[PDB]
Design a protein around this ligand. Structure first.
Ligand SMILES: O=C(O)[C@H]1CS[C@H](c2cccnc2)N1
Lengths: 300, 237
């Protein structure tokens, strides 16, 4: 187990940790989150009560350091920091009075959801999408644009997702225009998988990261990326068999977790209708189709 | 896009543009088979690529061999159109390459955009006008060269004949679209209007008769009358 101490909670806020969330009132005695499992990545996210504009948060790996949250009254946000002195942190965190002012990570044993949602997400790859090398943790917020969006305005504050653009020279071989536009297999297999991502794990990891950024922060560029990476697979006639099978599982857990009241804003009707009912891989997404149809029929 | 409401004069400015109409690329006759079924036979078609400022028509003849052994021909036809339009642009010196290509049907956008990815500064867009370019094959000399082709062939025409010696491109385009709309609406009567005077002929190197300015005014009036008459007949007005 690991712990995320908060110096204080000076402003009223909704705090999320992985898929869980709770409220903290202004100046409430709150010193953080206890009982967090290791091994994965995590995300802690915030939305201020008095201004629900800007959701923001931090992706982090407890294995990489001792992290804590302190409110910055100048910048007006909860900031993640690393405590270099493991002895002071062990002393703050084993402090019995201190854990009386914290919330417990409430993992139900049957629940494998967070691993299911983050299996292929890795901090090292996150820190390549979110470029801030002085910190072991990565900040993301609701407003951040993607590099691809910027190419259509602060490069330091951008999500450096892999550019996926169906109408680009990268996606289309000269002499194979119709073929490659109607069947994205070249773009998926040769360009993206062999060329850029190197393997399907890195691809799925960015797909999962994009989804989670879209869901936790309402980050629109991340939503676009998630949908694009799904559509690229579904619109390919040739996809390894393990990838489709694994894709069905990945999407199923994403759709299952998605807030029911967030469907009008996090799901692109065109893309989902295409993937489920018109695409080469329509029949390879059995479990995703079933949860979509029985959870979001209005969209289909 | 607009291209209407007093902003359609730009069509005839000095930025090079081409209209691309694919309506006559994939053409078929429909007949009954022996067993009783119905079968199509393809016939030669054409891509209609027009510079509205200069009247330069790039008529790419689509020979029926293009379709042999191919599936989903209506889809292929848009992609064949885009490949040929792209090839045309590439064949032209940079100073003659269009700044805009205006496709008459939205279905041509993606095939053309994809074939034109090497030309990022060429705008591709759907027309806002209803254009009668499908009636191009009612122009006898165009139909003749398409139906006689035994292979792929590009033929160049000035669809305005010598009119720009006397009128503006804006006026020529209006005359052209009036003629074509009349040919589309009542082809046999429009052709009789154009042939009413045996002493007024079509030059060997022209498509249209050699009307004087006043004769064109009369002809245009007759074409407008033809179009309005057909409207009345069709809608019982
Ligand atoms: O210096 C630190 O390492 C941080 C970690 S959490 C913390 C703290 C401070 C004051 C009250 N509770 C917790 N101080």
């Amino acid at each position: 187990m690991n712990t995320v101490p908060f110096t204080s909670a000076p402003i009223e806020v909704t705090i999320g940790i992985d898929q869980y969330s709770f409220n903290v009132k202004e100046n409430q005695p709150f010193h953080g989150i206890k009982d967090i499992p290791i091994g994965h990545v995590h995300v802690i996210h915030f939305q201020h009560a008095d201004n629900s504009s800007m959701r923001y948060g931090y992706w982090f790996d407890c294995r990489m350091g001792n992290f804590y949250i302190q409110y910055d009254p100048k910048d007006g946000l909860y900031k993640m920091m690393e405590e270099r002195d493991g002895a002071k942190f062990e002393n703050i965190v084993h402090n019995f009075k201190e854990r009386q002012m914290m919330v417990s990570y409430p993992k139900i044993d049957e629940d494998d959801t967070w691993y299911n949602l983050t299996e292929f997400v890795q901090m090292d790859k996150i820190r390549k999408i979110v470029r801030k090398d002085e910190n072991q943790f990565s900040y993301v917020d609701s407003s951040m644009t993607t590099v691809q969006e910027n190419e259509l305005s602060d490069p330091a504050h951008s999500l450096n997702y892999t550019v996926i653009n169906f109408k680009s020279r990268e996606a289309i071989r000269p002499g194979h225009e119709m073929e490659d536009f109607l069947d994205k297999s070249y773009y998926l297999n040769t360009v993206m998988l062999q060329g850029i991502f190197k393997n399907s794990s890195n691809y799925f990891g960015e797909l999962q990261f994009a989804f989670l950024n879209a869901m936790f922060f309402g980050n629109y560029g991340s939503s676009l990326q998630w949908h694009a990476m799904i559509e690229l697979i579904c619109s390919s006639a040739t996809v390894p068999k393990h990838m489709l099978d694994k894709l069905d599982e990945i999407l199923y857990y994403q759709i299952k977790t998605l807030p029911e009241q967030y469907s009008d804003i996090l799901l692109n009707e065109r893309v989902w209708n295409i993937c489920l009912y018109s695409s080469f891989q329509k029949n390879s997404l059995h479990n995703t189709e079933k949860i979509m149809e029985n959870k979001y029929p209005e969209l289909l | 896009g607009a291209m209407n409401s007093s902003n359609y004069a730009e069509l005839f400015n000095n930025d090079i543009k081409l209209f691309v109409d694919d309506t006559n690329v994939y053409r078929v006759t429909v007949h009954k088979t022996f067993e009783g079924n119905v079968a199509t036979k393809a016939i030669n078609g054409c891509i209609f690529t027009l510079n509205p400022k200069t009247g330069h028509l790039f008529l790419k003849i689509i020979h029926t061999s293009v379709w042999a052994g191919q599936k989903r021909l209506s889809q292929l036809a848009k992609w064949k159109t885009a490949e040929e339009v792209s090839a045309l642009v590439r064949s032209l010196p940079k100073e003659e390459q269009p700044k805009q290509i205006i496709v008459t049907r939205k279905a041509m956008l993606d095939p053309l955009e994809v074939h034109m990815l090497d030309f990022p500064n060429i705008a591709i867009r759907p027309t806002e006008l209803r254009l009668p370019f499908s009636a191009a094959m009612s122009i006898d000399k165009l139909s003749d060269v398409v139906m006689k082709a035994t292979e792929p062939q590009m033929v160049l025409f000035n669809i305005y004949d010598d009119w720009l010696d006397r009128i503006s491109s804006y006026t020529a385009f209006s005359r052209l679209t009036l003629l074509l709309r009349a040919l589309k609406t009542n082809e046999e009567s429009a052709k009789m209007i154009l042939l009413s005077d045996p002493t007024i002929t079509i030059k060997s190197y022209h498509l249209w008769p050699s009307f004087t300015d006043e004769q064109w005014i009369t002809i245009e009036s007759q074409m407008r009358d033809l179009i309005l008459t057909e409207y009345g007949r069709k809608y019982n007005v």
